[PDB]
Amino acid sequence: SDKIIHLTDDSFDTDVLKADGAILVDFWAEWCGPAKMIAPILDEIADEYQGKLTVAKLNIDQNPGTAPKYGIRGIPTLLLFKNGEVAATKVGALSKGQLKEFLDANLA
Amino acid sequence: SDKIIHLTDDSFDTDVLKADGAILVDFWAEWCGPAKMIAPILDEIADEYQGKLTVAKLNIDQNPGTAPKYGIRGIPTLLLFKNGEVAATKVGALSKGQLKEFLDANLA
Amino acid sequence: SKLDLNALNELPKVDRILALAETNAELEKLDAEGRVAWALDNLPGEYVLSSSFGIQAAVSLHLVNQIRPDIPVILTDTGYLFPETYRFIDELTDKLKLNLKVYRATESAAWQEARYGKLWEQGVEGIEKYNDINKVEPMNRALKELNAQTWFAGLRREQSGSRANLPVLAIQRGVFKVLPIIDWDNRTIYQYLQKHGLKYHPLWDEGYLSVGDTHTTRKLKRECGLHEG
Amino acid sequence: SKLDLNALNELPKVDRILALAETNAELEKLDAEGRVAWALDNLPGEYVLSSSFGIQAAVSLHLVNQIRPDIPVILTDTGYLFPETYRFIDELTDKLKLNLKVYRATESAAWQEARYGKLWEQGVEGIEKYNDINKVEPMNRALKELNAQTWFAGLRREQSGSRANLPVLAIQRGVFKVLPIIDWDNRTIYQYLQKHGLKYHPLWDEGYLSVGDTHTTRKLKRECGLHEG
């Protein structure tokens, strides 16, 4: 289901906050159906947006401490990062088109 | 629903048996759903096969005496006529493709 | 002698179909009018006539209504019926003079669309939840509110499918399910409609093979029979 | 004091939900285990546990089965379930040691396909006839054959929809319908699965959001909740 740069509370500091470039983080959980629902879309986006965007996924199940840090109200929430600093945030399950638009508009 | 050269027991002799050309007769009834189901298809065929084929419909409800004459077992049955003489007969509701094939093959 | 259902429900599904089989074997020889008549007084309290008001509702309604004036005709209005269907109902209820019992959902069309949304787009389970809240539950509530033990329905062995597992009489939900025009065929129904001056559903004469609901809900073995030979 | 249903069925749908409301108000404060326990002896004869064996059957099955060993687990096999679903059943029934009661149609898959055909392609009415002969009727037959008056189901207020019209306790078909894990949410279920070493359905971890039947039958508000704030 999920096959990308998987994150943890430990790696958050280096792999995201100290990452050189743009990173899209997907705060998900094993129980949220609409979260697993967007997994294939994120994989496809990771393929096409290669080089430009770094796609990542964080599982709140074993990594809870980071969701409150960005005021996550209810997974699936997407956090776009640009050089460690957070740009935009999308809440809920989205379509490939809506995801592309969400990314493109902020990426620039 | 039905909009074509409508037949009767009286007109059968002249409009079909004494007709110069190819005529496709549709023995139908108001109650047979699959019969009314092919009505739009027969209309479309009547439009495209104009000049070559004469499309007709006979309602057994008020015109019963002609169905037994061609051994009709159960409407919707299509009877293809070529110069008054019967060529082929198709039983049951058919698709536009299957109707075209049925016609073309015998028409020649 | 009058049949006891509080004992029939204390019997399995097979002993039921077997015990009732001896009675159905008799109902099989009688006509639609005889079955309704037999049901009138051999079965117990409150007799209802649930209709969908489709292509052939005029048959069962007229037949059963003539037999029993002002009979509780149950109409579970889903909320999205064809406009011409409603006018067909309001046309019949006035023409046939029916004691119409309307049973819609607990919530309305807009309510359901805001609470759940377009359930019909949400697959089979969504359609199930839709049919449960729009047809099943409302009917189960109708039988209870009307205190029925006998229920007549204009089902045929022909429409979609009700082969020899659908007896003229039965017990669905602790209620004697009766189907008078069960052995009837399209000819017999068409003839009944003609003989009594009753008309088909306004849409049947356009293209709609089997009307019901609109919202992507509505849109016949290749043959019918003059009798094989 | 032990509840009487032969009198509850002699009551309308609203007096039922109102009379039962006073009891449900109490069941609302207890946990899933307390509700099953309360149901064990405050309600009458034969307690069954019907499951669909989907994404979260392991929860209700394990919970109710631990409470009551060798409890009649009803599985209405439609005939076209996912292969991995059957193995999931046969894996559970052996792991949890369940008294499995299988109830399939009166006719088989090939029989239905020859007698009627692919009903799922025949629209909603076809799907209705399909669900009636494959799920509804088999279940109605199961309750009777097992002589149940109490029936447990692992339904949640979350899955598709069962807002405050679906009480922890109820009466569907002359049987006390109980739903213990009703107020439970995806977190609570996931946690239960983890704490008891139970696994999710083999397909859930692939893409199938809500597995059921295969033949064009199977293929979630945009969000879930960590709790709004």
From Swiss-Prot, chains C, D:
* GO MF terms, alphabetically ordered: phosphoadenylyl-sulfate reductase (thioredoxin) activity
Task: Name a GO CC annotation attached to this entry.
Answer: cytoplasm
Which subcellular locations apply to this protein?
Answer: Cytoplasm
UniProt keyword list: Cytoplasm, Oxidoreductase
Taxonomy, superkingdom: Bacteria
**GO process annotations (BP):** hydrogen sulfide biosynthetic process; sulfate assimilation, phosphoadenylyl sulfate reduction by phosphoadenylyl-sulfate reductase (thioredoxin); sulfur compound metabolic process
Which residues does the entry assign to the active site, renumbered to this chain? 224 (nucleophile)
How activity is regulated?
A: Severely inhibited by reagents which covalently modify Cys groups in proteins.
Give the protein's biological function: Catalyzes the formation of sulfite from phosphoadenosine 5'-phosphosulfate (PAPS) using thioredoxin as an electron donor.
Q: What is known of its domains?
A: The open, reduced form of PAPS reductase is able to bind PAPS, whereas the closed oxidized form cannot. A movement between the two monomers of the dimer may allow this switch in conformation to occur.
Membership in a protein family:
Belongs to the PAPS reductase family. CysH subfamily.
Its name, as the record gives it, is: Phosphoadenosine 5'-phosphosulfate reductase
What is the species of this protein? Answer: Escherichia coli (strain K12)
What gene does this protein come from? cysH
